[PDB]
Amino acid sequence: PHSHPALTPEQKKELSDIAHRIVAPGKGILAADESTGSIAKRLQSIGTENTEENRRFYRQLLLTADDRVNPCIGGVILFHETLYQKADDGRPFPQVIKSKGGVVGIKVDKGVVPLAGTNGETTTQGLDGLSERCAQYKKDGADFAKWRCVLKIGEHTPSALAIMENANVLARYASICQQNGIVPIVEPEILPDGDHDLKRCQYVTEKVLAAVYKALSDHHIYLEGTLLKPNMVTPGHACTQKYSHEEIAMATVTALRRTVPPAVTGVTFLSGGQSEEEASINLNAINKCPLLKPWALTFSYGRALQASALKAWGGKKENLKAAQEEYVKRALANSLACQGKYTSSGQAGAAASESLFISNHAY
Amino acid sequence: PHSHPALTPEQKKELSDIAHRIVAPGKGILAADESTGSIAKRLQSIGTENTEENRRFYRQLLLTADDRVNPCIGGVILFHETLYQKADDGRPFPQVIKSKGGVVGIKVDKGVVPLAGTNGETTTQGLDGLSERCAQYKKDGADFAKWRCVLKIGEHTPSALAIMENANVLARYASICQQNGIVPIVEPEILPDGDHDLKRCQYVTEKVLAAVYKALSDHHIYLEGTLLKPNMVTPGHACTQKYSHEEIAMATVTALRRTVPPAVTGVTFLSGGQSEEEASINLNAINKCPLLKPWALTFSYGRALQASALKAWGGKKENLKAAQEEYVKRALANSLACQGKYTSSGQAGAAASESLFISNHAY
Amino acid sequence: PHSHPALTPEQKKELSDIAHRIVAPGKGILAADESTGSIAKRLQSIGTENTEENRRFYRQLLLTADDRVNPCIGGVILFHETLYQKADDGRPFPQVIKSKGGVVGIKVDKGVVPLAGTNGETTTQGLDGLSERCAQYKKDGADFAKWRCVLKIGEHTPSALAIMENANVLARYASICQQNGIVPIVEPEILPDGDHDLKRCQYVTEKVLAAVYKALSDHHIYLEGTLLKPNMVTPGHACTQKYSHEEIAMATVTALRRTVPPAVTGVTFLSGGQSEEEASINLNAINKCPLLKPWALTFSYGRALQASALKAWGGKKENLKAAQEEYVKRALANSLACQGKYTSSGQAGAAASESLFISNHAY
Amino acid sequence: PHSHPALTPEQKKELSDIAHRIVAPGKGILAADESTGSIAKRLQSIGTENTEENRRFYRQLLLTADDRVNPCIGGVILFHETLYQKADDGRPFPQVIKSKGGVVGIKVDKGVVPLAGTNGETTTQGLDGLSERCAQYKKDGADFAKWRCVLKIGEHTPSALAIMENANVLARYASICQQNGIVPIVEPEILPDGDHDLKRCQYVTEKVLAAVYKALSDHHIYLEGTLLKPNMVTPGHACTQKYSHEEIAMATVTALRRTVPPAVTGVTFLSGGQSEEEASINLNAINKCPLLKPWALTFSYGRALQASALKAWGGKKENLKAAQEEYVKRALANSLACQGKYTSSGQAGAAASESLFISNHAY
């Protein structure tokens, strides 16, 4: 094949530097890129209405937390709206983030659309005019982007089409981002839905990631200038089998070692429905896994970092500091976890998570 | 593998009926889908300012040509603007076309975008929200669509990436159209630029079409409900070798016979820079080729059907009937040509009006 | 891509001439390439010992049948051993076939081998030294070859791996044959085993054939110099739903129309365990199918042409004529069937069949 | 997709264990697997006749070197003949090797064969009856195998077909080896022939390796139970631009980091015509490269470990010790090199002797 450099040494350096800053030791990502409809559900659970003000305020609560979170947060993924909002101190959010030492990120996908001829499978849209959008976003303070593809495990899924199509669209997105000096976070999310065991998820994860990396190569993607945002390898939500977090860690790291080239700067795990403590515990075990891990294994959590913060807030401006405190604590917990130094005894024995699917009722 | 029907027998029948109606014996397509930017270049050549009124007038001149064209035009591809315009008599353009027995088509792609890491190669965008657009267009009178991918022959082109990427995007587009009752015209245009010979073009065309059909299969496309719009197989514009129309015909038909499944309802050739007469002569020869041709071989001409009309018009409202006459004459010529009955007085085809690249000056 | 002509005009010509001769109007193929292990069971069912002489004699019985079979047989596929055996008159079997107007073919594969990590799927071996073998076989009177790949329909089969691997091995084989002036019959047999229905078989057939042709294109195969030997589209042997022959014909023709390019010279169907009468009736229905078929649709039957001859033979030399007649009759019937001229004779009582398990214990 | 375990936990355990033994710290592989035709060349260059006794003597010379080589040689790749030969003391070579702590390997490919339609490109044969051969070899003392695929850099090479085909055949071979308890060394050698530069070689190496790992994933290969044997990234033999060992090291490690998953147990570089000293220095520089390398980076040298031993021997049994000493010297130098602990004297040394040519004389 013939080389026609997509990027110059200068462009490669910029991308790599950005990617490394985000995942520097002890740092992770705060995923606060929920679209208006998504954040609406969250605000409703706390009896708060979905207005631009409450959204701006809620985002402000997280973004303006004290400097204790500074060394914990390498980057923050924002939704379009929030990128153009300002804090009470008059500063645009992207500036608040940068002043605190974090990198600003932007969600660029436009949602999933169904693939005809499949069993409820999807692909993701958002490529049209992405180049110009990325140029504007870069100018407006964003240095990294996020694009999410969804895949489901079932009797006939993921199908070969779904795997090929999602891997290809992720590569297109990644290519466009790098041309505009933006680091793309590749997110091939495999849903935990179903009653499949740990091994089936590991198998599917390995097949999906292999396809993802072949596509990135085909599209001439600069790996050092990217981050991978995968699901941890866990059993299905309805699985009746019990697993320790060391098993989840082992399966997760094993899957990654078999598919992710060491040039990839970092892997930022999505917690996908896991509770705050469970997500920290799992990330900690992953970093404690005795296998050689050549990339940073950190977090890119949404709910796992916000659950207790949103709860404590509950629309009441009064509870501002206490709500921020909850967030600061999860940030600190996960900072320790991505370094393999979060203390707990691999806890799962009494602190509950609905193990109804393991009890006698699941029979 | 496992089937999850993309289309019901009812949806299939409709798509099939539409495709067959467009390429019925003696019928072809008028491609009047130029966008503002392209139409500008056309109007400028004749000294007519690019105004909505002049674009609407010009399209009216073509669409309201007398019934003699009716037996010749199976379909008309329109640009978005034109689909919502009306004729002087108040009738919406789509209705005018339909009253004359034609099927209305709409251009749905959003142009080509560069593929990084290639030698100036592109892919085409337009997938975002395509489903909703197709649903609207359908309600508004359109039954078929056009999407154009462009590839070029050169030292390192087309590359494996460009071939795969364009074939895949074409399949995605086709899939979305079929879900909305719209027949997709698959257009993988290989540019005639360069000094490559006939055989070079034949080779690349065969490789390209093979990729296109494999992609359509992977995406579960209903072939009977599609039309192919390829480039005829010709030598590059700067080739120094002289060829006869019988040679281009043999090469074109051979390339298609080796790649296009018989289920494909029809092949509507693009003129690709050929003069009006040349396009008719080549299409005629293609239809008189001894080889078995299991699909209708017709036209989907833009300039090849408008060159004389536009010139004759000259923006002068007084030249209307004369300009329309030129158009009617080209439509009649191609109608005969798509049936292999176009034998100009003297039973022969015209020769090259210049062909400087075959003279001593090309040495 | 870039061309480096795999074949010269003269080589293509030769392959094209051979392919056309085999499938000329009213002609089909006698598949008599049973290996030592396969024919042993045939001889055992008729209480005859499996010796070289018995194999030579049985083969001679078929090859020397009266002149009426001449116009019905375009080719005969032989097993290695038979190619070097002689008729009682001291004439090599290849000579006897040629004197009767037939083309000599040789089975070149070395059987199926398991594909690890699959649910009992296989690929086919035989590529090693195939080029040398082919050059020798051509020298010895063989003009075409046969290679059989086997695919199975089940819940998880055929898998993407099986489809890809078998298509690629068929393409490697076809390439080597053509380089040695041997026309390759591509045989991607989808076994009829299972309880799947017609739609299921059609779906799978369309998917495998599309992969087969993409593979042949990638490997630069000259399609005009090849023949396709597929299974007809039928329900699984264990399927309870009874389908009409019209349905089977429609499903088979539709599948081929959507995947087999017009350049393929002919399709020589395998009977796949169908009774002699059934195989002829289905072949006739396929040829009467109202859809356009741009390729010859004929037979390449093994047991569907021999069941009665073998039975009527029984092992006794005296039965020579009896057996030959049964074969001649079947050849004639299929010669008519491949032209849509077969008048289904129906049935009453019995004719011939295979095996013994639940009948006449004490005779 | 769905899993159907190719291997059991126990089988995986054995494969992983063997792979790790071969590439243990400070250890490399002696590639003494030259066929009769290749070894004949080396013998001729030193005035010795190609005979079984002389071949046995030469191999014995290398295999019976003093105990200092024991910690240096993790494995020895033998040609079929040698595996069944015995040393002067009656012990079969496999026994001699195991007694000194090494693992016994066997070359299992049957050479390269041309791919029709390419610019002199090849694929490799040897799959027929490979499982049975592996079963025999395992039983006879071999624990790993080697299969060589050859790719070439040029204007249109390596082509898409060559890359896909060679990667697919390596995967098939690797699968069969693992089913028989044999660790396969995957050798996708990109020839140093040509005038292309360093960047071109790196570009090609990255594309080839990505294809290789995608194929290995598709065929369900257990990566932990494999070794990769690639070429170092260097300029073509005919390139006139001078490069430093640091540039070679950076290019090589960078290419591997972008394509070779961490799970791969080790990378055993082939020397590719490099002089003994050159091969040691480059290997050392590679291990000195500051970039993170999650796999063992060692040697699998043929000519680079035998050049001096061969000439010092000169066909005279008397020169046995002198010859063995030269070998031990190169083996010790590379043991240090694969640990980044090697140092040079400043210039060429006893390694350069043969040098590059261009049609000087065919011999």
Break chain C into its structural domains and give their ranges. Answer: 1-363
Residues contacting A11, CB < 8 A, separation 6+: A178, A181
The Cα–Cα gap between D241 and D121 comes to: 26
Q: Which residues of A touch D (CB under 8 A)?
A: 1-3, 158, 160, 199-200, 203-204, 206-207, 210-211, 213-214, 217-218, 223, 254, 256-263, 292-294
D113 three-class SS: strand
User: Does the beta-carbon distance from B160 to A220 stay under 8 Å?
Assistant: no
Q: Catalytic: which of D27, D152, D229, D311?
A: D229
The Cα–Cα gap between D17 and D24 comes to: 10
- Provide the β-strand partners of residue D148: D187
Is residue C300 within 8 A of residue C337, CB to CB? The reply is no
Could you give the dihedral angle defined by the CA atoms of residues D64, D67, D72 and D74, in that order, rounded to the nearest 10 degrees? 60
Q: Dig out the tokens for B58 from the structure.
A: 């010009």
Q: Which residues of B touch C203 (CB under 8 A)?
A: 1-3
Is residue B141 within 8 A of residue B92, CB to CB? The reply is yes
The Cα–Cα gap between A74 and B357 comes to: 61
The Cα–Cα gap between B272 and B279 comes to: 9
Q: Which of A2, A127, A172 is nearest residue B128 as measured by Cβ atoms?
A: A127
The Cα–Cα gap between D28 and D6 comes to: 29
Phi, psi values for residue D170, rounded to 5°: -65, -45
* Chains in touch with D (≥3 Cβ pairs < 8 A): A, C
Q: Which of B123, B128, B161 is nearest residue A125 as measured by Cβ atoms?
A: B128
User: Does the beta-carbon distance from D1 to C159 stay under 8 Å?
Assistant: yes
The Cα–Cα gap between D33 and D55 comes to: 11
**D187 is an active site residue:** yes
Q: How far is D160 from chain C (nearest CA, A)?
A: 8
Exposed, middle or buried by CB within 10 Å (0-12, 13-18, 19+), for B8? exposed
D105-138 burial, b if ≥16 CB within 10 A, otherwise e? bbbbbbebbebbbbbebbbbbbbbebbebbeebb
- Provide the β-strand partners of residue B151: B190
Detail the residues of D annotated as belonging to a binding site for beta-D-fructose 1,6-bisphosphate: 42, 271-273, 300, 303
Residues contacting B145, CB < 8 A, separation 6+: B105, B106, B107, B108, B134, B137, B173, B177, B182, B183, B184, B185
Give the 3-state secondary structure of chain B.
CCCCCCCCHHHHHHHHHHHHHHCCCCCEEEEECCCHHHHHHHHHHCCCCCCHHHHHHHHHHHHCCCHHHCCCEEEEEECHHHHCCECCCCCEHHHHHHHCCCEEEEECCCCEEECCCCCCCEEECCCCCHHHHHHHHHHCCCCEEEEEEEECCCCCCCCHHHHHHHHHHHHHHHHHHHHCCCEEEEEEEECCCCCCCHHHHHHHHHHHHHHHHHHHHHCCCCHHHCEECCECCCCCCCCCCCCCHHHHHHHHHHHHHCCCCCCCCEEEEECCCCCHHHHHHHHHHHHCCCCCCCCEEEEEECHHHHHHHHHHHCCCHHHHHHHHHHHHHHHHHHHHHCCCCCCCCCCCCCCCCCCHHHCHHHC
The Cα–Cα gap between D22 and D1 comes to: 34
Q: How far is C168 from chain D (nearest CA, A)?
A: 8
Q: Which residues of C touch B1 (CB under 8 A)?
A: 158, 160, 163, 203-204, 207
DSSP H or E segment with residue A227: strand A227-228
Helix then strand then coil, in percent of chain A rounded to 5, is 45, 15, 40
Amino acid at site B7: L
User: Does the beta-carbon distance from A128 to B123 stay under 8 Å?
Assistant: no
Residues contacting D251, CB < 8 A, separation 6+: D198, D199, D201, D202, D233, D234
Is residue B342 within 8 A of residue B284, CB to CB? The reply is yes
Q: Dig out the tokens for C9 from the structure.
A: 């005009």
Q: Which residue of C has its CA nearest to B254?
A: C263
User: Does the beta-carbon distance from D161 to C2 stay under 8 Å?
Assistant: no
Mutate to test the interface with B, among A125, A133, A182 (most CBs of B within 10 A): A125
In terms of DSSP H, where are the helices of chain D?
Answer: 9-22, 36-45, 52-63, 80-83, 93-99, 130-139, 160-179, 198-218, 245-257, 276-288, 303-313, 320-337
| Residue D266 DSSP symbol | E
What one-character-per-residue DSSP string does D344-363 give?
--SS--S--TT---SSS---
Residues contacting A350, CB < 8 A, separation 6+: none
Q: Dig out the tokens for A22 from the structure.
A: 């985000």
Q: Catalytic: which of A229, A276, A278, A326?
A: A229
Peptide bond preceding C158: is omega within 30 degrees of 0, i.e. cis?
yes
**C311 is an active site residue:** no
Is residue D288 within 8 A of residue D270, CB to CB? The reply is no
Is residue C31 within 8 A of residue C302, CB to CB? The reply is yes
Q: Which residue of D has its CA nearest to A254?
A: D263
The Cα–Cα gap between D43 and B317 comes to: 92
Q: Which residue of A has its CA nearest to D292?
A: A294
Q: Dig out the tokens for A161 from the structure.
A: 């089409």
Q: Which residues of B touch C262 (CB under 8 A)?
A: 257-258, 260, 262, 292-294
CA triplet D186, D189, D194: central angle to 5 degrees?
A: 175
Q: How far is C13 from chain B (nearest CA, A)?
A: 15
This structure was determined by X-ray
* C359 known ligand binder: no
Exposed, middle or buried by CB within 10 Å (0-12, 13-18, 19+), for D139? exposed
Exposed, middle or buried by CB within 10 Å (0-12, 13-18, 19+), for A45? exposed
User: Does the beta-carbon distance from D261 to A263 stay under 8 Å?
Assistant: no
Is residue D178 within 8 A of residue C114, CB to CB? The reply is no
* C273 known ligand binder: yes
The Cα–Cα gap between A167 and A258 comes to: 17
DSSP H or E segment with residue D150: strand D144-151
The Cα–Cα gap between B52 and B284 comes to: 36
Is residue C9 within 8 A of residue C255, CB to CB? The reply is no
Single out the residue of C324, C106, C282 nearest to residue C192, CA to CA. C282
- The CATH number of domain D1-363 is 3.20.20.70: yes
Alpha carbon D6 to chain centroid, angstroms: 26
D102 three-class SS: coil
Single out the residue of D231, D253, D227 nearest to residue D170, CA to CA. D227
In terms of DSSP H, where are the helices of chain C?
Answer: 9-22, 36-45, 52-63, 80-83, 93-99, 130-139, 160-179, 198-218, 245-259, 276-288, 303-313, 320-337
Q: Which residue of C has its CA nearest to B4?
A: C203
* Chains in touch with C (≥3 Cβ pairs < 8 A): B, D
Q: Which residues of D touch C6 (CB under 8 A)?
A: 116-117
Measured from the Cβ of residue C6, the count of other Cβ atoms closer than 10 Å reads 18
Handedness of CA C333, C338, C341, C347 (dihedral sign): positive
Q: Which residues of B touch C213 (CB under 8 A)?
A: 210, 213-214
- Provide the β-strand partners of residue A147: A186
C296 three-class SS: strand
User: Does the beta-carbon distance from B217 to C254 stay under 8 Å?
Assistant: no
Q: Which of B217, B254, B258 is nearest residue C210 as measured by Cβ atoms?
A: B217
> In Å, what is the CA distance from C280 to each residue of C249, C304, C339, C350, D230?
12, 8, 11, 16, 56
Q: Which residues of B touch A162 (CB under 8 A)?
A: none
Residues contacting D307, CB < 8 A, separation 6+: D275, D276, D330, D351, D353, D354
Q: Catalytic: which of C107, C229, C276, C311?
A: C229
Alpha carbon D323 to chain centroid, angstroms: 22
The Cα–Cα gap between B118 and B112 comes to: 14
Residues contacting D245, CB < 8 A, separation 6+: D281, D282, D284, D285
C30 three-class SS: strand
Is residue D265 within 8 A of residue D58, CB to CB? The reply is no
The Cα–Cα gap between C16 and C23 comes to: 11
DSSP H or E segment with residue A205: helix A198-218
C27-62 burial, b if ≥16 CB within 10 A, otherwise e? bbbbbbbbeeeebbebbeeeebeeeeeebbbbbbbb
Q: Which residues of C touch B218 (CB under 8 A)?
A: 210
